[PDB]
Design a protein around this ligand. Structure first.
Ligand SMILES: [Mg+2]
Ligand SMILES: [Mg+2]
Length: 117
RNA sequence: GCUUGAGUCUCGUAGAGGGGGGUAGAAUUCCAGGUGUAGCGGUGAAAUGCGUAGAGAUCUGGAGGAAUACCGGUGGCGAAG
């Protein structure tokens, strides 16, 4: 439809769920998928396998997309932070740079208290 | 009377010692806008809760508060805090 011919995939991976969204360099989202929405409701959605399933499910259908080269950037503590890439790269888009954001707060915003369980 | 206790004077050193003022980066939250769409979030597992009145994720701009990520150590300073 637009034939971007290049893009970047933002992965937000946490201990609870994984989200993957394809986007343009100018911050324009085309599609997204989540392990929770990929039929892994419960404890499996936090597993690496459900992350790669969502990655490939979001990467599929490249015809209308048109993104040939798809960079990658991950954020947060994921289920290895590598399985999603292992699936996405084989999905068809070659990877040349992966950046990791993982926002590290330089102090401030006192974290929540501890869990006594 | 004396100089060894105590003290003053000259030249230097290290240090989160204390009070006042200024400024910088990261991150959280919130507000406005753009793409986008069915979930998000949380747990041992759930639910409440948020979202089709468009959430979450993502990009641009803005407001404001608080603390200074490594350096950082069987390091330092302070009578103690
Ligand atoms: Mg918590
Ligand atoms: Mg003196």
């Amino acid at each position: 439809r637009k034939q971007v011919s290049d893009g970047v995939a933002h992965i937000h991976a946490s201990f609870n769920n994984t989200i993957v969204t394809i986007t343009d360099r100018q911050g324009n989202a085309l599609g997204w998928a989540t392990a929770g929405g990929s039929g892994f409701r419960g404890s499996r959605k936090s597993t690496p396998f459900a992350a790669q399933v969502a990655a490939e499910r979001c990467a599929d259908a490249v015809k209308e997309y048109g993104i040939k080269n798809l960079e990658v950037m991950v954020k947060g503590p994921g289920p290895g932070r590598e399985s999603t890439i292992r699936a996405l790269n084989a999905a068809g888009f070659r990877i040349t740079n992966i950046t990791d954001v993982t926002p590290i707060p330089h102090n401030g915003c006192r974290p929540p208290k501890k869990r006594r369980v």
